[PDB]
Amino acid sequence: DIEKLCKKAESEAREARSKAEELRQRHPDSQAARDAQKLASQAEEAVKLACELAQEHPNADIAKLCIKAASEAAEAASKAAELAQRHPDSQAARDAIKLASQAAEAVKLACELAQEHPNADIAKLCIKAASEAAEAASKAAELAQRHPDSQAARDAIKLASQAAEAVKLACELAQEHPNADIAKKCIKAASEAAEEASKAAEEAQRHPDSQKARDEIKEASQKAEEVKERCER
């Protein structure tokens, strides 16, 4: 069962890598192409780490959670790369690539934390937060593909990036203090930020001019900035 999950994750990572390779082949010295290469590398790394964790902890919840997270990260990578293919010389595409990179990094960090502390609830919290960050990245990329030059897409990408950064920081804090209440508070807050990012992106996908989507983006952004402001130590 776990094997097939790892295979699926691997396949998605391969999709991301294929798109990155297409970009690199078409325009080698392009910033977006190189960024996409690095992104594909990070997706592959996340998947590799997840599968390794699966080897270290057979049929453990932590393992399948990590594999699913890595799959989400690879999916986000693929979507960002595709956005880059559909819009060359586009700053939004580069920002989406960077976003997918941040999500990948968050998943990698959550997997490392899980490898260090497999039986800590903070590990599951961090994996969940990382997964939600990846999902938010995917939805922001979807929105950007659906409405390329829209304010909604840009704001969604920015918000998803902020949420990814917040999850990253909370996971670092958790790595420093795995038993600390503050680490749990931070990772839950970052999780909420990512969730709201996803919700807002979903709102804006259907209704790009949704004022509710904009308000949710505001709120989620303020939450992410608060997390990044409070969870440095």
Side-chain angles (χ1 to χ4, degrees), residues 63-117:
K64 40 173 161 292
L65 284 172
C66 278
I67 295 173
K68 285 179 182 179
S71 307
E72 293 284 352
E75 173 181 330
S78 180
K79 295 186 177 303
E82 183 179 0
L83 179 64
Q85 287 173 316
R86 296 186 56 150
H87 305 278
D89 308 24
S90 177
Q91 180 61 50
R94 284 187 296 270
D95 290 344
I97 289 173
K98 182 200 174 185
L99 162 57
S101 179
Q102 289 172 319
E105 292 167 10
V107 173
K108 288 163 52 62
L109 185 51
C111 290
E112 291 175 3
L113 183 66
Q115 188 174 4
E116 297 174 8
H117 315 275

Side-chain angles (χ1 to χ4, degrees), residues 179-198:
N179 295 286
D181 290 9
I182 185 58
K184 292 190 60 180
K185 297 183 179 182
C186 288
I187 195 64
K188 286 177 182 182
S191 241
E192 293 182 357
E195 292 159 1
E196 191 167 4
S198 280

